[PDB]
Subunit: 140 residues, 3 copies
């Protein structure tokens, strides 16, 4: 089925730095390549579906954030990637399908969407990584 | 007369969604096409003119936010538009002139600038709409 | 030596306005051309170096923010510039070298980086000026 854009767009930003890391300006999520182990949590993302009691809540990553059934934060150079798994902190089940991550069952779902590093990638070049998600519902 | 750029730039963002609306990430102004009735308030915009006791306070919409004496929020695709009226919450009178919205009389004016949907547009495609306003004064 | 990108990116924004200045929307740093005197402080920038006890903390301005040993905020038109000096509020000593501003001695330094107008420039056109700084360490 096809995702129907219907919601705001969230983003997970992560700055990857060497062991000696300098934080200039405002605070953001930063990590040393060393901490980029498998299952290492990045940020999280809050979600609140409204009036979706008859539709399946969904999230759609930007086209540069998913390929071949895998989500990854993209660098400011649109080259380097940080592969991550997307999972809700509750029991709930979801299905991934071409960048879309939709809930298996209807309901005005809400809560947090965890994002963890997908397999140790301690060799990821330092830089500014982003993952953009757009809310919406889904049908086939 | 011509508007003289002299101030910061404010923005009114609105995300238009279907009835089943999902809010991913940080909170912002969102609305279902259904709520886009006439006079339906969007956001508002705060304004504070300083040292303008001898000049007429003014606001200038981006070139993509006004045409032929009408302001409209533009979509991220620079195609879809949401027509809106711009009005101050006080008695004060203003004059619209080629994207500029200036106060009829001088004075270091301040307060809120309301933005309401201009005529029912419940068929406006879902997406991210923006209206950019720049502060300044005006003379002829 | 060469700067090693390793940290987040801070920014100093300043809106330059005429004497009659209108602040539309959210609040930001604004100044009238008149206030752009020599040594007139703009914003400041917070810095926190971590695990840098064996490396020299550093800051690197965007390529459009420095030339020939001088930093300057750039306008949204990538033309107008506001020359500024960069200095830490503490006794500490630093060295400028091709857009990089690095600490003379190692140590996980932290604190504030002052930014003051470099010589009276009361004729700087009104507009939106920015200075982008990226954290990191430095070696030769
Ligand atoms: Cl998490
Ligand atoms: Cl309003
Ligand atoms: Cl300062």
């Amino acid at each position: 089925g096809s995702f129907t854009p219907s919601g705001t767009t969230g983003t997970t930003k992560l700055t990857v730095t060497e062991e000696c890391q300098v934080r200039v300006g405002d605070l953001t999520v930063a990590k040393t390549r060393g901490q980029l182990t498998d299952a290492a949590p990045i940020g999280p993302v809050t979600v609140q579906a409204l009036g979706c009691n008859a539709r399946q809540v969904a999230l759609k990553a930007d086209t540069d954030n998913f390929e071949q059934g895998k989500f990854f934060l993209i660098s400011d150079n649109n080259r380097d990637k940080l592969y991550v798994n997307i999972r809700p902190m509750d029991n709930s089940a979801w299905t991934t399908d071409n960048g879309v991550f939709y809930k298996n069952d209807v309901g005005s779902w809400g809560g947090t969407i965890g994002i963890y590093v997908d397999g140790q990638q301690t060799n990821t070049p330092p830089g500014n990584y982003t993952l953009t998600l757009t809310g919406g519902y889904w049908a086939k």
